Amino acid sequence: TLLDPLANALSHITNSERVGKREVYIKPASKLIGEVLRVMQKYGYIGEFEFIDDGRAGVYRVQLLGRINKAGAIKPRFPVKVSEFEKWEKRFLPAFEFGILIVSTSQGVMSHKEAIEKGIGGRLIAYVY
Amino acid sequence: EIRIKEIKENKLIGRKEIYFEIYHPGEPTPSRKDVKGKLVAMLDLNPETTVIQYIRSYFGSYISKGYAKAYDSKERMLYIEPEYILIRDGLIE
Amino acid sequence: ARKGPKRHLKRLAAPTSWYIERKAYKWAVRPRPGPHNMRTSIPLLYIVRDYLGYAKTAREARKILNEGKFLVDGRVRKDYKFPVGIMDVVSIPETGEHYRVLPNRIGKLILHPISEDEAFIKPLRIRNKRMIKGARVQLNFHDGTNHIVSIAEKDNYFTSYTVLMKVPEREILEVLPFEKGAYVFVTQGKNVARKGRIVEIKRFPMGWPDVVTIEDEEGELFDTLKEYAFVVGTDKPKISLP
Amino acid sequence: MRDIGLRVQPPAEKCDDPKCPWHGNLKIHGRVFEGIVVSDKPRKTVTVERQYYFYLNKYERYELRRSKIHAHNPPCINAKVGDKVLIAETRPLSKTKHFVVVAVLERAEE
Amino acid sequence: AIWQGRSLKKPSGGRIVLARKKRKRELGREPSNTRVAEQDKRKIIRTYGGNRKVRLTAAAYANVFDKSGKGRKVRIIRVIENPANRQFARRNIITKGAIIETEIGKAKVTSRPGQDGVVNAILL
Amino acid sequence: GKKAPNGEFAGRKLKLKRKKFRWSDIRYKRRVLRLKEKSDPLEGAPQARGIVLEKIAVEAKQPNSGMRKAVRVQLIKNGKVVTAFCPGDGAIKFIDEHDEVIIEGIGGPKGGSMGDIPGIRYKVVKVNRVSLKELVKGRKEKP
Amino acid sequence: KRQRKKYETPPHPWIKERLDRERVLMDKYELKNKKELWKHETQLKNFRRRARRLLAARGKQAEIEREQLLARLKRLGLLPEDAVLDDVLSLTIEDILERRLQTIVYKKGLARTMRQARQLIVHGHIEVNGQIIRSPSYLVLKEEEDTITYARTSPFANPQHPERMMIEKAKQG
RNA sequence: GUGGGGUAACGGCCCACCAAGCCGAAGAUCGGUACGGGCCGUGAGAGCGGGAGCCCGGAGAUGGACACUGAGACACGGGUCCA
RNA sequence: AGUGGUGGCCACUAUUAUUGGGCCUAAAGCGGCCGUAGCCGGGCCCGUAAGUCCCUGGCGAAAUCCCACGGCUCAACCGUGGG
């Protein structure tokens, strides 16, 4: 049975781009998936992404630019404050400031870099590099 | 040679505290009596009302610090100052 | 285990409000009970021996105190463990030297020298209101002293109100109330040694004290416990406050 | 109706017990809590339960921990199982009783 | 030694072994068992902190009060009913809340003769 | 499948599993029940003072061939008797019958019998309070 | 609480490369023990640790400590007056070694050899600002090197001590 | 729980009655082990291990038991009893 | 002016695996299925705001630890100041 749309989606993206396809369709579409898809596209990892009204749960269509190396959803929603953030960068990224992470703060789903100056903690949701 | 920095008057005790430095480059450490007779000259104090406790010469240092006290009457030391620095200065046998 | 009260205090465990070399010696003088609390005051011997440096040894400080030269708020105190707390005025008339004990920004006590005109006024915060038989009202101050008034004038006093207290002959002088805009000096908390003016009074239920919002001279807004706020003037401080 | 200073309407009917905060002698001070009644078999006594999470350093997940509390239940409220109840610290009542119920927020039927 | 110490059992029935002895402050004292007599016998006891507790052991007089508020020093004939425990009433033992038979009639005692040293009651 | 449980509210099982399987470890079991500190004849003592009873030698394990000298020591502390290897060249002659001696573990694998000689656990250091190494070197004299 | 050693031993006593890299400096700088070299290595490592810690820190205390660190490094004469936090990572042991009292007093031409300078120092014959120090391991600041002269009470403050002319000729030579 | 006792003081701490409660598989009870903490050792750290050495809190005078006197004790250089 | 032997502890070890291990053939999936507690659970809207996050008041003693300065040649050690 399905348990988490997001991690399935990120694994879908990564596995589809290892072979290196062009258009990827994610079946279990939800709002949080779209809020996620905003972030890295704002960093230019993916091309266009859009929503298709299927009639059951909606589909998400994405074009892949061949930019991401690994994109995965950290499951156990670790809540992290601001000043200790570096302790997690060493756990999911290959180098100093390489790649990003996604946090669901009080103000919504959004990139980790933009949260440092916004000064907001929250729970880690996913990562990509 | 002895040169002063601190000359401070304690009027609750009516006593003068003198912190001074002795220049002794290359010669043995001066004794108590010598500096005792030295300070009293240009400070113009009564020798019996004047007492010295310590003169510390540091390692590898030619300038040594020293502290002396200068009272006014013969009973102030007998009352307030402890009994050692009269004997070490010879003021009490 | 322990069986009764103790008369000793290690130098290490001394209160953090004291400027004392902790590792100089093993032992320190135990403060006897007195006007203020342990966190608020210091033994007089440490004032004489360390802050003033008149006496190098404790024995001569004790001798001088026995001579009674030092006046504590206009009263000679020969004891060498007396606790001197906040806004107590220490006067030595032989030098004419008068100081007021005030908290540091770090939270330690320091001596602010003052002129002679300030040496006969002590501000006391009204810690509690009670009243005794004969319908005689009594006010317990923050420094552990007590004063008696009659029932008629009771509405002119409230807890936490400041009173300028002529300590030389025990005469009330003025009553500064606890109202918005009053000039206030902090005694404890992270905002210690601050002076500002009251803005808001945050009443708190469930045993939690009131919080007062104080704005500094430059307009910085902070908060502090009501007990920690000491009123010192209606609009401007009536005393020289660092 | 004598004030206790807690934001709640008193129980309607009054009780003659010397242990009712609204209608007795004992008073309310100290900590307050919210819990659920699970056992009320003995006389004028309740066993409220409170659920919460606990964090661990080594595994950084959560561990449910439970707290059972014995509060006195005066007749004016008459707590039953399935009810959400506000509890307050009191003076030592008995060997185990040290709390009292002061409000019923939702009845069992809710 | 009467020890008013910890219960030696846990609430869950678990046995507890005492990690420490009995301190002096935590011991109790003998029940008064105040009896009715033709005179008034009292004991003054030095207590914790140097205070004094007066304890009435024999009682011969009582303060019967009317609902209005007036008190009368009237004698005690016998005890009627002790709701606290039925053995006391037979033994002419007086405690708080007991019902006493006096010249006025029936009175309920609202005093602590083991601590107060006096007997005060309300006519019924 | 996936290593489990990974849940945010799974602390109890994630802890219990690890505690349980920490018993599958052997060194931790050896420590926490202290059975090293119950089977020991030396009762956790790197040294002990004993009396010698008789000198015995043992055959080296194959292919190593020779005669390894040693003695039998009953322990004055408690009374157990163990073998005690004697090092040094011709040192058996120096160690006599009924000698106060100081004995200490031989530092093999896990403290076992060192190298090519089996069974033994300990070696001698001082004989009648005199260090045996020098007596092998002949610098000192037995009292 | 028990006072701990201030220096770190090498992780392996018998690595050829590290052993010889030590030995070259021992012969060049002539220290009594490898303990001294290890102490100075640890002294460097403290600066390195502070630098790498501070470089990743965001806060007021971080910046304040950073400025204090830079200031005291410059005071020692290790760094230029316009150094930054990035160049400390390029520092070497020899930067510390040249600041040793023995090294500096030799580079003033006050001895014909490292060991001669060490002998003069340990025998209380070299003064700094009119004060005598008997520790060749001492590290000099950037505000005191000009005060490195012969001790006045020494016979070598006298310009015609027989070794003195040979010393000055070696300076010339 | 009701109503009482003794306590400096509330409390089954204790007493007379009334009723069947209380705890336990998320680990009761029983047993093993052990003064708790600030801290210390190691380690890049996650962490593992330890709590004697200095300070705070807890407790004990050979094992046990008990009073008096004192604001403060069941009292190391006060007292009484058994072994 | 240390240096060796031995015993206890951490690392070496990702041989305790949260970070971070394996279970076809090397120790290691129970013969199979059902099912309670527990754990993990579909999409959208509204509310609540317990967790979650930001700000702020009180509070976690001293001692130890990090850094600057100053004093004892320096150091260790001590104080002043910030953490």
Curated annotation (Swiss-Prot), chain D:
CDD domains: Ribosomal_uS17 (cd00364). Keywords: Ribonucleoprotein, Ribosomal protein, RNA-binding, rRNA-binding. It holds the Pfam family Ribosomal_S17. GO terms for cellular component: cytosolic small ribosomal subunit. GO terms for molecular function: rRNA binding; structural constituent of ribosome. InterPro entries: NA-bd_OB-fold (IPR012340), Ribosomal_uS17 (IPR000266), Ribosomal_uS17_arc/euk (IPR028333), Ribosomal_uS17_archaeal (IPR019978), Ribosomal_uS17_CS (IPR019979). It comes from the Archaea. GO terms for biological process: translation. NCBIfam families: PRK08572.1, uS17_arch. Part of the 30S ribosomal subunit. Belongs to the universal ribosomal protein uS17 family. One of the primary rRNA binding proteins, it binds specifically to the 5'-end of 16S ribosomal RNA. HAMAP family: Ribosomal_uS17_A. This is Small ribosomal subunit protein uS17. It comes from Pyrococcus furiosus (strain ATCC 43587 / DSM 3638 / JCM 8422 / Vc1). The gene is rps17.
Curated annotation (Swiss-Prot), chain E:
The keyword Ribosomal protein applies. InterPro entries: Ribosomal_eS8, Ribosomal_eS8_CS, Ribosomal_protein_eS8_arc, Ribosomal_Se8/biogenesis_NSA2. This is Small ribosomal subunit protein eS8. It comes from Pyrococcus furiosus (strain ATCC 43587 / DSM 3638 / JCM 8422 / Vc1). Gene3D superfamilies: 2.40.10.310. Keywords: Ribonucleoprotein, Ribosomal protein. GO terms for biological process: translation. The gene is rps8e. Pfam families: Ribosomal_S8e. Belongs to the eukaryotic ribosomal protein eS8 family. GO terms for cellular component: ribonucleoprotein complex; ribosome. Part of the 30S ribosomal subunit. One of its GO terms (molecular function) is structural constituent of ribosome.
Curated annotation (Swiss-Prot), chain F:
Keywords: Ribonucleoprotein, Ribosomal protein, RNA-binding, rRNA-binding. GO terms for molecular function: rRNA binding; structural constituent of ribosome. Gene3D superfamilies: Nucleic acid-binding proteins. GO terms for cellular component: small ribosomal subunit. Transmembrane segments: none annotated. It comes from the Archaea. InterPro entries: NA-bd_OB-fold (IPR012340), Ribosomal_uS12 (IPR006032), Ribosomal_uS12_arc (IPR022863), Ribosomal_uS12_euk/arc (IPR005680). CDD domains: Ribosomal_S23. Belongs to the universal ribosomal protein uS12 family. With S4 and S5 plays an important role in translational accuracy. Located at the interface of the 30S and 50S subunits. This is Small ribosomal subunit protein uS12. It comes from Pyrococcus furiosus (strain ATCC 43587 / DSM 3638 / JCM 8422 / Vc1).
Curated annotation (Swiss-Prot), chain G:
One of its GO terms (molecular function) is structural constituent of ribosome. One of its GO terms (cellular component) is small ribosomal subunit. The keyword ATP-binding does not apply. SUPFAM superfamilies: Alpha-L RNA-binding motif. One of its GO terms (biological process) is ribosomal small subunit biogenesis. Disulfide bonds: none annotated. Keywords: Ribonucleoprotein, Ribosomal protein, RNA-binding, rRNA-binding. InterPro entries: Ribosomal_uS4, Ribosomal_uS4_arc, Ribosomal_uS4_CS, Ribosomal_uS4_euk/arc, Ribosomal_uS4_N, S4_RNA-bd, S4_RNA-bd_sf. One of the primary rRNA binding proteins, it binds directly to 16S rRNA where it nucleates assembly of the body of the 30S subunit. NCBIfam families: PRK04051.1 (NF003139), uS4_arch (TIGR01018). Part of the 30S ribosomal subunit. Contacts protein S5. The interaction surface between S4 and S5 is involved in control of translational fidelity. HAMAP family: Ribosomal_uS4_A. This is Small ribosomal subunit protein uS4. It comes from Pyrococcus furiosus (strain ATCC 43587 / DSM 3638 / JCM 8422 / Vc1).
